[PDB]
Amino acid sequence: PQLHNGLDFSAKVIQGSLDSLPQEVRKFVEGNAQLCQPEYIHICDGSEEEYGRLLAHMQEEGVIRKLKKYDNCWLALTDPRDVARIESKTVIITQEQRDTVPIPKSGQSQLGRWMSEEDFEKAFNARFPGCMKGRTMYVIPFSMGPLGSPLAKIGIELTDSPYVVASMRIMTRMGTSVLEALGDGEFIKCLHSVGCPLPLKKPLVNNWACNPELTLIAHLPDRREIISFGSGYGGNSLLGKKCFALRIASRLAKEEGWLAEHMLILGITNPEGKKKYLAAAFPSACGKTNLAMMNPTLPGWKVECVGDDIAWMKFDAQGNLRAINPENGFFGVAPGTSVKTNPNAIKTIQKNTIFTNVAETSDGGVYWEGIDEPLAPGVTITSWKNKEWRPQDEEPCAHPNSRFCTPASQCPIIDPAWESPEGVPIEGIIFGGRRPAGVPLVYEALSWQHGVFVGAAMRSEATAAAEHKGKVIMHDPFAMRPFFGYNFGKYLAHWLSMAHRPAAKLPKIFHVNWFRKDKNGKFLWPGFGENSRVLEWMFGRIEGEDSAKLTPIGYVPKEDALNLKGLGDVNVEELFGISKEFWEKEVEEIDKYLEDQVNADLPYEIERELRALKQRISQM
Ligand SMILES: Nc1nc2c(ncn2[C@@H]2O[C@H](COP(=O)(O)OP(=O)(O)OP(=O)(O)O)[C@@H](O)[C@H]2O)c(=O)[nH]1
Ligand SMILES: O=C(O)C(=O)CS(=O)(=O)O
Ligand SMILES: [Mn+2]
Ligand SMILES: [Mn+2]
Ligand SMILES: [Mn+2]
C-alpha cells in the first residue's frame, strides 16, 4: 500500500514488469529503488536483442569501443584508479569476529577483514542513499552453475553499470529463464553501484564511472547479501564470481557439506583412451588459465577445459568427489597470452568477447605485452591509457591486470561434460604457486591429512593481481587467502572432515612448482604445454603406478619416471633438489604463520603434520 505515490516504481520500468517478479524479488528491487533513487528500472531478460541494444548504448556513450578486426568484440578502458579487485576494501560482516577470521595470537589477521554490523550500517548509509540518481538500475537474474543442477544457486544483481550487465551475460547464466526457475525460492541478494549519481560532482576519467575514495565490497553471509560500492572492475562488480561463488558460497558449503574453491577443472585423456578429471588451486597470476586450456606437447594426450577459476564440489552417494564449474565464461588475464603460452585462448577470444584495459591496434585489433605476434607495417598502437604508444616507451601498452571476458561455449577444447548438472568426478587435486627456490617441480602428499597441510602451507612470490607488489614470498593457503567466507581454522577442519565420510573416494593431492629458477634467475622448467609431462606422471600415480620415490616432503618421480624426451637439456638434479637448509627455514615460517594466524582454531591434525614434517627434515 501507500498513502501517496513514493513506493510503487512501476512507472519507471523500461523493460519487464514488477508484477511478473516473485514477491521477494519485487521487494528487493523496489526497496533498493526507493533507497538508491534510479531514474529507470530495466529488468534483464538475457536476450540477444537486449544485449545488442546494451552494447549499442555503451558505444554511443563512449563507454566501450568496437574492435572492428574481430566478430562482435569490444574494448573498455577504465579509470586507472579502478583496475583490479581490491583486497584492502573487501570486508565480511558477522556478529562475532571469530566466525569470519580466527583470532590471531599476536598480529593482525591476513585471512580476512571483519567489519561489525554497526560499522557497516554507518558505511552503507554514507554511500548508497541517492547513489543511482539519474541512472538506470538493471536487474540481473543469474544462475551460478547449470540451470537446475543440484549444485546451482541463483542470484539477483542490482547494478547501475551497463558494463556489468554485459559482462554478467558472459560470465553467468542470465535472464528470464532464471526467474522462472527461481519461483519463490531463496536467492543471494547482490547490490552494486559505481557510486556516481548524476549530476557528476567529479569529472569522469576515460568515461569510466567509479568512486575510488568510497570503494567498499561487503559480504553479509547471514543475510545472504553482497553489497558493493564504488568500483566497476572485475571481482568488485561482477558479484557472481568472487563475492558469491567463493566468499558467500564457501560459507554455504561449510553449512551444507560441500566445497567452493579457487580451482580450475580439466579433463585429461591418455593414449590408452582413459580419461581423468583434475582440479588445481593456484593463486591469481600463477597460471590456472594456462593449465586449464593447455595444448599438451606429448602425442596421444588430450586436455579439455571444464572451468579455469572456480569449482564447486560435493561427494555424491557413491563417494565420488563431483565438481561443477559455476561460471559461464572465462575472465582471463590478457597480457602474456600468446600462441605459444595459450593457443586455445587465442582461438576463443576472437568473437563475442569483451576486453578491458588492453591496447588497440589501428586496424581494430588487440595488443598486449607477451602477445608474441608481429604487427604489419603501418599498424600503430593505442595504449590502455588512450595514448599513442611505441615499443620504445617504458609504459606497458596494456595494464598488467587487463582481462578478456569470453563465453566458455566457444572454447575449442571445452569439455563435453562442462554443463552436466551432476558434475565431473575429481581424481586428483593440485596445489602450487610461484617459488623461485627450494621447492621441486612436483611432489605427491603422503595422505589426506598431509595433503590438507600442503594446501595450508602454500606460499607464492608476490605479483600484480591485487594491490601487492614486489618479490616478497607471501602465504596463500589453498589459493584462497583473499576469498575465505569464514574462519580459516574451521575451513581446515571442514577439509579434514571429508576423510570421515562413508565410502569417500579421496583424490590424490599434488603440489607443483612451475617457477623454480637456477642461480642465473632462469626458469629450470619450460612450462606451459610441457606441463603435460607432469600431468602424465600424476595420471600414472592415480592409476597406481610404482613411479614414486619417498622424500621427507612427500613422493617425487623416480629417476627416469618423467617423460623428458625432447627437452634433453633439463637440469633434473636442480629441479628436484631438496635442501635440508631450505626446508628447515620453510617449516619454521609455516609454523610461525599457522601459530599466529590460526592460533586456537588450528586443527590438531594440521599441527601434527607440521611436527611430522619438522621431524623428517631433521633426520636429513
Ligand atoms: N614460467 C611459467 N610461467 C607460467 C606458466 N604458466 C603460466 N605462467 C605465467 O602465469 C601468468 C598468467 O597467469 P594468470 O592468468 O595471470 O593466472 P590465473 O591463475 O589464471 O589467475 P586468475 O584468473 O586471476 O585467478 C603469466 O605470467 C604466465 O607467463 C608456466 O607453466 N611456466
Ligand atoms: O583475482 C583473481 O583471481 C581473478 O580471477 C580476477 S577477479 O575476478 O578477482 O577480478
Ligand atoms: Mn585465470
Ligand atoms: Mn581467480
Ligand atoms: Mn582422521
Write the residue with the smallest CA distance to atom 3 of ligand 2: 284
Domain CATH number, residue 342: 2.170.8.10
Instruction: Mark whether 322 and 364 lie in a shared domain.
Output: no
**Helix 580-597 × helix 604-618 angle, to 10°:** 160
**Mutation pick for ligand 1 pocket among 171, 236, 290 (CB with most ligand atoms within 8 Å):** 290
Strand 90-93 with 216-220, pairing: parallel
Same domain, 360 and 392: yes
- Give Cβ neighbours of residue 56 (< 8 Å, ≥ 6 apart): none
**8 A C-beta contact, residue 196 and residue 211:** yes
- Total count of domains within the chain: 3
CB 238 within 8 A of CB 84: no
Cβ(89) – ligand 2 distance below 6 Å? no
* 284 Cα nearest atom in ligand 2: 3
Answer yes or no: do 235 and 333 share one domain: no
Residue 1 located in a structural domain: no
CATH of the domain at 617: 3.90.228.20
Q: Is 309 in the pocket of ligand 2 (CB under 6 A)?
A: yes
Structural domain ending residue among the three candidates 363, 388, 412? 412
Partners of 514 in the β-ladder: none
Residue nearest to atom 16 of ligand 1 (CA): 285
Contact of 110 with 260, CB cutoff 8 Å: no
Q: How far is CA 66 from CA 136, 165, 355, 394, 404, in A?
A: 23, 17, 10, 27, 14
Quickly count: other Cβ atoms within 10 Å of residue 458's Cβ: 24
Q: Say if residue 564 is in the same domain as residue 458.
A: yes
- Give Cα separations from 322 to 266, 421, 423, 541 (angstroms): 13, 10, 5, 20
Query: What's the alpha-carbon Rg for the chain, to the nearest Å?
Result: 24
Integer angstrom CA distances of residue 457 from 259, 260, 430, 460: 19, 19, 13, 10
Residue 134 is assigned to a structural domain of this protein: yes
**Cβ atoms 219, 268 nearer than 8 A:** no
Atom number in ligand 1 closest to CA 514:
32
C-alpha cell of 572? 633434473
Which of the listed residues 257, 289, 306 is the one where a domain comes to its end? Answer: 257
3: number of Cβ within 10 Å: 6
Helix (H), strand (E) at residue 219? strand 216-220
Mutation test residue for ligand 2: of 168, 236, 241, 262, the one with most atoms within 8 Å of CB: 241
Which of 590, 282, 231, 247 shows the shortest CA–CA distance to 465? 282
Residue 509 belongs to a domain: yes
Task: Answer left, alpha or beta for residue 107, where phi above 0 means left and psi between -120 and 50 means alpha.
Answer: beta
Quote the strand ranges of 85-179, DSSP E.
90-93, 114-115, 136-144, 153-159, 173-174
The answer to whether residue 408 is domain-embedded is: yes
| All cell numbers assigned to 413 | 577444447
Region for 285 from its dihedrals, namely left if φ exceeds 0, alpha if ψ lies in -120 to 50, beta otherwise: left
Q: What experiment produced this structure? A: X-ray
Q: Are 239 and 277 contacting, i.e. CB atoms less than 8 angstroms apart?
A: no
Whole-angstrom distance, CA of residue 278 vs CA of residue 401: 26
CB 197 within 8 A of CB 176: no
Task: Characterize the bridge pairing of strands 40-43 and 153-159.
Answer: unpaired
The phi, psi pair for 387, rounded to 5°, reads -140, 145
CA gap 116, 118 in Å, rounded:
5
Residue partners of 81: CB distance under 8 A and separation at least 6: 205, 210, 212
Question: Cβ atoms within 10 A of the Cβ of 459, count?
Answer: 18
Q: Whose CA is nearest to atom 1 of ligand 2?
A: 284
Which residue, 329, 278, 317, is CA-closest to 510? 278
Residue 286 annotated among the catalytic residues of the structure:
yes
Which protein residue has the closest C-alpha to ligand 1 atom 14? Answer: 285
Cis peptide upstream of residue 400 (ω within 30 degrees of 0): no
Shared domain for 250 and 195, answered yes or no, is: yes
590 within some domain: yes
Residue for grid cell 607440521: 610
From the list 286, 397, 405, 411, the catalytic residue is 286
Evaluate whether 512 touches 534 at the Cβ level (below 8 Å): yes
3-state secondary structure 453-464: HHHHCCEEECCC
> Which residue has the least CA distance to atom 25 on ligand 1?
284
Residues counted in the chain: 620
Residue 463: DSSP 8-state? -
Using an 8 Å Cβ cutoff, are 468 and 82 in contact? no
DSSP H or E stretch at residue 404? strand 403-407
Q: Is the same domain home to 267 and 246?
A: no
CB 172 within 8 A of CB 143: yes
Give me 553's grid cell: 616432503
Helix or strand or coil: residue 438? coil
In whole angstroms, what is the distance from residue 21 CA to residue 498 CA? 40
Q: Do residues 245 and 144 lie in contact, with contact meaning Cβ atoms separated by under 8 Å?
A: yes
Asked if residues 308 and 294 have their Cβ atoms less than 8 Å apart, the reply is: no
Q: What are the helix (H) ranges across 37-151?
A: 48-61, 117-125
Task: Kindly state whether residue 4 falls inside one of the protein's structural domains.
Answer: no
Contacts of 172 (CB under 8 A, 6+ apart): 140, 142, 143, 144, 155, 240, 327, 328
Among left, alpha and beta (phi > 0; psi -120 to 50; other), residue 64 is: beta
Whether residue 507 is found in the same domain as residue 607: yes
User: Which CATH number do you get for residue 216?
Assistant: 3.40.449.10
Query: What separation in angstroms does the CA of 127 have from each of 162, 215, 220, 229, 432?
Result: 20, 9, 17, 7, 39
* Ligand 1 atom index nearest CA of 291: 6
* Resolution in Å, one decimal place: 1.9
Q: Determine the Cα–Cα distance for residues 335 and 354; give it in Å rounded to an integer.
A: 15
Asked if residue 327 has its Cβ within 6 Å of ligand 2, the reply is no
Q: Does the Cβ of 234 fall within 6 Å of ligand 2?
A: yes
Secondary structure element (H or E) that encloses residue 583, with its range: helix 580-597
Where b means 16+ CB within 10 Å and e means fewer, 245-280 reads bbbbbbbbbbeeebbbbbbbbbbbbbeeeeebbbbb
475 beta partners: 459
DSSP letter, residue 71? B
CB 584 within 8 A of CB 88: no
Select from 385, 412, 439 the last residue of a domain. Answer: 412
Q: Which helix (H) or strand (E) holds 268?
A: strand 264-269
Q: Do both 616 and 535 map to the same domain? A: yes
**Residue 65, H or E segment:** strand 64-66
Q: What are phi and psi of 558, to 5 degrees?
A: -60, 155
Same structural domain, 202 and 305: no
Instruction: Say if residue 557 is in the same domain as residue 440.
Output: yes
**Is 212 inside a domain boundary?**
yes
Pocket flag, ligand 2, residue 465 (CB < 6 Å): yes
User: Cα(269)–Cα(553) distance, rounded to whole angstroms?
Assistant: 29
Considering the domain architecture, whether residues 73 and 157 belong to the same structural domain is answered as: no
* Structural domain containing residue 511: 258-327+413-620
Amino acid at 579: S
For residue 438, which phi and psi values (nearest 5 degrees)?
80, -35
Q: Could you tell me the three cell numbers for 588?
A: 619454521
Say how many Å lie between the first and final Cα of the chain, rounded.
Answer: 77
CA–CA separation, 163 and 236 (whole Å): 13
Helices (H), 273-413: 288-292, 343-348
Domain membership of residue 3 (yes or no) is no
Please state, in angstroms and rounded to a whole number, the distance separating the CA atoms of residues 244 and 238: 9
- 498 and 586 in a single domain? The answer is yes
